[PDB]
From a paper:
Copper transporting P-type [name] proteins are key regulators of cellular copper and are found in all kingdoms of life. To further dissect the transport and regulation mechanisms of P1B-1-[name], we focused on a member from rice ([name]), OsHMA4, or simply HMA49. This protein is localized to the tonoplasts of roots, and is involved in root-to-shoot translocation and grain accumulation of copper. [name] has three predicted N-terminal ferredoxin-like MBDs, although the one closest in sequence to the M-domain and the P-type [name] core, MBD−1, lacks the metal-binding CXXC-motif.
The protein was produced and purified from Saccharomyces cerevisiae, frozen on grids in the presence of detergent and with one of the established state stabilizing phosphate mimics BeF3- or AlF4- that inhibit protein function. These have previously been used to trap the outward-open [name] conformation, and an outward-facing (E2.Pi) transition state of dephosphorylation, respectively. We also studied the effect of no such supplementation to [name], which has previously yielded an early E1 state of AfCopA26. These various conditions yielded four structures, determined at overall resolutions of 3.3 (HMA4BeF), 3.2 (HMA4AlF), 3.6 (HMA4apo), and 3.7 Å (HMA4Cu). Inspection of the cryo-EM HMA4BeF and HMA4AlF maps and models suggest BeF3− or AlF4− associated with the TGE- and DKTGT-motifs, starting with T480 and D641, respectively. However, in HMA4BeF/HMA4AlF the M3 transmembrane segment is partly covering the MB’ platform, and the two cysteines of the invariant CPC-motif of M4 are further away from the intracellular surface than in HMA4apo/HMA4Cu, indicative of an architecture less compatible with receiving metal. On the other side of the membrane, an outside-exposed pathway is present in HMA4BeF and HMA4AlF, but not in the other two structures. Equivalently, the position of the omnipresent TGE- and DKTGT-motifs in the soluble domains shift from distant in HMA4apo/HMA4Cu to adjacent to each other in HMA4BeF/HMA4AlF, the latter representing a requirement to permit dephosphorylation. Collectively, these observations suggest the HMA4BeF/HMA4AlF structures represent early E2 conformations linked to copper release, likely [name], while the HMA4apo/HMA4Cu rather represent early E1 states associated with copper uptake. In HMA4BeF/HMA4AlF an outward-open, water-accessible conduit reaches the CPC motif cysteines. From there and to the extracellular side, the pathway is lined by residues of MA, M2 and M6: including M941, M391, M292, E387, M295, D384 and M319, of which M295, E387, M391, and M941 are highly conserved.
Author numbering: 184 to 957
Write the structure that this text describes.
Amino acid sequence: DVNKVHLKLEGVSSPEDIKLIQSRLESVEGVNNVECDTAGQTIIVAYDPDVTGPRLLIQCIQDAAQPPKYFNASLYSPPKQREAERHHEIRNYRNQFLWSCLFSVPVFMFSMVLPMISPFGDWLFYKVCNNMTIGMLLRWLLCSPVQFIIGWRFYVGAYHALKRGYSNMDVLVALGTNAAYFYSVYIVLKALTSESFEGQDFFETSAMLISFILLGKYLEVVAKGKTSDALSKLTELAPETACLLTLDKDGNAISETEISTQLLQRNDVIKIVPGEKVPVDGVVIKGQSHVNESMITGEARPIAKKPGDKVIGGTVNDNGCIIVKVTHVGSETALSQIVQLVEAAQLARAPVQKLADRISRFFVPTVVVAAFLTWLGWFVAGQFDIYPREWIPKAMDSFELALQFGISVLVVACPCALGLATPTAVMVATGKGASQGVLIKGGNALEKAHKVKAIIFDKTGTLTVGKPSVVQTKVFSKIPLLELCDLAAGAEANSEHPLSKAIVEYTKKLREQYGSHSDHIMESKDFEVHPGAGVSANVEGKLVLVGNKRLMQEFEVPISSEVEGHMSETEELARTCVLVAIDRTICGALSVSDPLKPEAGRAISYLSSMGISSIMVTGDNWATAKSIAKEVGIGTVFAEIDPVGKAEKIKDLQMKGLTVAMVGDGINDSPALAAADVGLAIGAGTDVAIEAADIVLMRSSLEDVITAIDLSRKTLSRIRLNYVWALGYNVLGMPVAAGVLFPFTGIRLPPWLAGACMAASSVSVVCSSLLLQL
Ligand code: ALF
Ligand SMILES: [Mg+2]
C-alpha cells in the first residue's frame, strides 16, 4: 500500500476517466512513480513506504467521480475464486470422466456382451469387405475419440515425463492404452486384407482404461480436501475501520472521522471505543483500561494498560477509552506477522510423493523387459522350431505370434485400478472418523499423521479447559461452607469477572452438594471493591470481603498458613489457585483453578506408550505450566512463548527428524498449527484455529488426538493393501498373457477372461470402516 498501493478503479470503463485520474495524480507530488496500466482499468501508485498515505490520493481519485458511476479505487482480490475453482475443477474432472464413459461404456456394451447376444450379435458379426466385421469398424470409430481426444492428458503426461523423470503413471497408461489400440488397429486392418484371419480387437481395454484412470483423477480431486484453509480470517480479526482523533491537544481539536484502518498510517491517533477491536498496535497516550489480549499470550486475563505502554492490534479492551499514537502499520503489525508466518508455512507444505509414481517408476521398466523377453521367447522358438507349427493361428507368421504374445503382456500388465488406491478410500477416515469426532481437512493430513512421533500441546484451552474453576476448595469465613459461597456469590452479583463466573460455578456445585439452590442472594450492597483487593460488598447487611491481603487488612484479617497453602505449586501458598478467594475470615481457602484435564492424563500416557513423545509450548506463566505438566506427565515445559516461538519449536523438532503435530485452540497456535506436518485444532477454540489446522477436533477431547493417529495408521495399513490388491491381479496375469500356460494347456490369451482383470482389480479395492479403541 504505502509502498505500492494498487488502485483497481471501480465504476470506470472508459480511458478518459483513467486519464483524468492520471492527470490529477501527476498534479500531486510525493509519488515516486506511477505505473500506468491503462489496459486493465487499474492504476499503480508507487511511492516511499512509511510516509503520508492513501488518503489524499484516494480523495484525488474520488474527485473525478461523474456519471454513470462513482469512481472508487482499491486493490480487488478474488473473494471466493477458491470455492468456485474447487467446484469447477471437481465438475471438470467429473465431466471428463462422464464423457469418457459415454464413449467407453458404448465400446464395452458392444464387444463384451452384445456380440454374445442376438440379434445384435448377428449385426455386429455381419461382415464387411473380407473379414473386417462392422463391429470392428464401429468400435474403432467409437474408441478413437476417447484415446485421441480425452487421452491428450495421458500423452502429454508421458511426453513430459520423457527423460526428466523415469516413469510416472502417465507413461504406464500410455503404454497400456496405445499398445492395445494399435494392436487392435493392426488386427482390424489385417482382417480386412486377409481371408481367414480371425481374432478379437483389444479396443475394449484401451477405452475402458481411460475411464478408470480418469475416475482416479476425479477421486484424487474430491479426496484432496476441503477448499484449502482461508487465511483471511486472520485479517478479519483486525477491524476494517476506526475513528481518527485530532482532538483536545493543542492543534488536535475535533476530528472524529471514520477512516478505514488500512488508510491509517504512522504517527496517527485513534479513539478506541470501550469494548471494540483495537485497530492496530500502538502506544497509548492517556487512559486506563484492561485489554483482553489473546494474540500473544492467548490467555484471557485482562492485562493492564497505563499511559505509556504498547497495545497490540487485533485486541479488545473493556475498561473505557484508550488514546493511542499509532506504532508499526500494515505489514509490521502482530496480525501481519501471523499472516506471513501462516502463509509461508502453508505455501511450503510440499505434496507427498504418491506411491503410484514410485510403483510406476519401476513397474513400467518391468513390463517392457517382460514383453521384450516374451517376444525374445516365441520368436526364437520359431527360428529353431521348438514349438509345433500348428500352434500358430491362421494367416500368421512366427513374428506375428510373438507379437500377439508380446503385446498381450503390455495390455494385461497395465494395473488399471492403480489411481483408485489412495483416493478410492475417499479417505473413509473422512467419514467414520467424523463419527468418531475427527474431521480431516484433506488427505495429506491422514497421510502424514501416521508417522507422528512427537506432538506439541497448548496449555490453555487444549490441555486445560481454559475457563477458571474453583475446584480444590476448603472452608474459611466464620459462616457455613454453603453460607460461605452464598455470601460470596451475593458479592458477585454486580461483579462480572472470570473469577466471578468461577465462584458462581463452584457455588452451584456446592448447592448441588448442599441439596439444591434453596432461596437466592441480593445485590452487591456497598460495592466496596478495591484495586487488586478483590470483591467486597455489604450483601444482606454483611460487609463481605472476597479478595486478597489488601482487602483482608482493609478490615484487618490476619494473614496465616492458608495464604501459605493454596497457590505457588497450585495449592502451596496464597489462598486460591494463584489468587484471592478467602471471603471474610480464614479457616482455609479455595482454588480458582483452570479445570485440569478430564482425560488428558490418560491421553498423554497412551501417547507416550505408542512411542509418541509430548511437548508443552504454552504462553502463560512458568509457574502455572510447571504444575500442569508435572501432574499430566509432559516432559519439556518451554513456556512464555510467542506465536513465532511456537512455530520455531515445531520447526526445530522437525529438523531433528521427527514428524511433529501441533494441537492448539487459539490464534496463537495458528503459525504453529500450519507449520506442523499435521495440525490439530480443538473445536472449542478460535475459528481461525479451526481454519488453519489440517484436523479439527469436534468433540473437545485430547483423546481424539490418539484416535486421529490410530485412524492415520490404520489407513496406511490398507493403503499398502489396495496397492497389493491393485498390482497383484495384473502381475499374476502377466504369465498368462505371455503364454506360459499355452505349452502346458493349449489355452491362448482370452480376450475377456484376462482383459477384464480391472473389474477384479477395482472391485478388490474395498475399504473397511471399523475403528476406535479409546
Ligand atoms: F492456550 Al496457550 F499457550 F496455553 F495458547
Ligand atoms: Mg489455547
